[PDB]
Design a protein around this ligand. Structure first.
Ligand SMILES: Cc1cc(C)nc(N)n1
Length: 167
């Protein structure tokens, strides 16, 4: 049993809810929250900006030190950093950004990072301002992630479309 509440079950291991990932993290304090990161860990706007704002910019400070030491992530890659006030850990995962021309086949590689963690609270990778089709992102998630993933969908309209169209 875990603390996640109000989710619709899509598969054996994938659950979904209409919720802002910042309010859900604050309530649950999951072991892992996933950030929709870029390779520079610049959490300017989007999911990353919303999570970073909720940490009072401490996520950005920690991320700048990570990049100064290690250099940029790969598209499709990830790193584990602190979850600050939101979670034990934040798994920063880089899905391909369609608005930068990145290979959508890298979305499967991005979701494979989730398999290193038994339970996660996550957004749909490459959705929102990363430009991918969220219906596609949910299909890749279900077909790639084998660990238990609790997806937070920010848009009520999009949530209802993801559920209604789910095969
Ligand atoms: C305030 C907010 C929350 C989420 C999940 N994303 C964005 N872009 N902004």
């Amino acid at each position: 049993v875990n603390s996640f509440s109000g989710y619709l079950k899509l598969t054996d291991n994938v659950y979904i809810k209409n919720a802002d990932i910042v309010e859900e993290a604050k309530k649950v304090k999951p072991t892992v929250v996933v950030n929709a990161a870029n390779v520079y860990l610049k959490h300017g706007g989007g999911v990353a900006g919303a999570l970073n704002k909720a940490t009072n910019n401490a996520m950005q400070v920690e991320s700048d030190d990570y990049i100064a030491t290690n250099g940029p992530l790969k598209v499709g890659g990830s790193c584990v950093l602190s979850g600050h006030n939101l979670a034990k850990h934040c798994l920063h995962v880089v899905g391909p950004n369609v608005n930068k021309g990145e290979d959508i086949q890298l979305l499967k590689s991005a979701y494979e990072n989730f398999n290193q963690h038994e339970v996660l609270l996550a957004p749909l990778l490459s959705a929102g301002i990363f430009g991918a089709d969220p219906i596609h992102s949910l299909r890749v998630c279900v077909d790639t992630v084998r660990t238990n993933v609790y997806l937070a969908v920010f848009d009520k309209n999009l949530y209802d479309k993801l559920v209604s169209s789910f095969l």
